[PDB]
Amino acid sequence: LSPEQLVLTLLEAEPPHVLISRPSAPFTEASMMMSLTKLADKELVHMISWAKKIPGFVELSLFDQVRLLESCWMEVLMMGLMWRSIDHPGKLIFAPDLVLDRDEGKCVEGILEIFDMLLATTSRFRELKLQHKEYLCVKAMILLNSSMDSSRKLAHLLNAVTDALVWVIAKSGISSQQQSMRLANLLMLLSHVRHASNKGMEHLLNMKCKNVVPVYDLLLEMLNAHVL
Amino acid sequence: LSPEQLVLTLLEAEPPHVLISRPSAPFTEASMMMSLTKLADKELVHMISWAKKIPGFVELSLFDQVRLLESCWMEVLMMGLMWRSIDHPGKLIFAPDLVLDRDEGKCVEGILEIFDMLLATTSRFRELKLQHKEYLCVKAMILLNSSMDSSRKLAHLLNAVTDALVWVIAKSGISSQQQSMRLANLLMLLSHVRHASNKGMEHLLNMKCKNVVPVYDLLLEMLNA
Amino acid sequence: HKLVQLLTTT
Amino acid sequence: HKLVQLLTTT
């Protein structure tokens, strides 16, 4: 399986566009958190189908499949969030019917801090002019690299996806030095996506513990499994 | 400044190893946390001197400097810990006479798990056969990339260290494709160092609240950020 | 255990 | 502030 063919399979694994089916209206702390959680739950279902479509993923032991997804889910959701927001500065496109402004994150205590992080990182990917194919590899790497017989498979799969990202960068046709700097820059931004996801989890857990948000089953499980 | 001059600069900028002795009696939850907090406090002081030697660091605004350091200090401490333990599988060299076995992490509620991921990452580094010059670049990158026109200068500084990392990897003589592959493999591990770094800080806050060990001055300021 | 059932069904 | 001191006073 060549780099181009692996990248295409990721394109094919891409989850469908998700909408929360909400008529446009002003956000309150209740409506916002209810929307974020409802959207996260829907995306989680699509995320599972996505991972299964990654060559070799289902070949992994069921234990690894579970622990990989339980640890990275929020990070994957946020990476998706940033690719959707790339062409819309100042905005966070969680979903077509869930577009938020920085000032709207002020109605929920502690979230403004996080929106600013997401907006910053997104602004950074925009500066680097992240390409769709780079997005695809990076997102897959997030899943395969969250591993904090089946072990070698994971390493092989992760290596293959890295190999694919290098290929994508090589196709851009920029100098070899600029290809090394770009690869390093994209990989270093993940640390920032990971940071904003750690904060998003802390904030979400806090919200669940207060039963302030109806935490749907899949999302409750993903959340409960992570902190544990 | 060429990539080589930058590496030579960081090489000299390396902080000297902090000397701390292992308690005479076998570790207790408290004596261990005391050993760790004390070592960290001493290393933190050296870390500040090390940072000011990273070309251009002192040229950033005092606020960027502080934000950068508060944001990554523990990850920097652990990167150094992993490098020191590179050649000692199953062993964690917090310092010359503070060699903790993976087992001793039992006397501290919830630290063993952290010792395990620290040892795992260390093995990944051993497996990649991380080189001293690569290590120096990566550790500095940890500091300059924790951004968690001084902003414009921070980027330039980060690219310079990245440029040096690329230069060092080229000096290994492997194919251009493998140079790219090794670069990716090295950086993908920053996520794991970071993970153990977050588990370590959260675990330290917890021990402080549990009054299991006193945490003040420099260490406390960094803990709260 | 929705995760596990979704991982074992299509 | 200790951090600030080490960064500027040292």
Ligand SMILES: C=Cc1cc(O)cc2nc(-c3ccc(O)c(F)c3)oc12
């Ligand atoms: C922003 C902080 C944040 C805080 C919180 O308490 C719950 C959240 N849920 C998300 C979220 C949902 C769907 C996505 O696709 C995504 F990228 C993020 O972000 C959240």
Ligand SMILES: C=Cc1cc(O)cc2nc(-c3ccc(O)c(F)c3)oc12
């Ligand atoms: C292991 C978890 C851990 C937990 C905790 O509550 C306090 C800690 N301090 C360190 C530490 C100290 C000096 C170092 O040089 C280093 F790398 C780590 O690790 C700690």
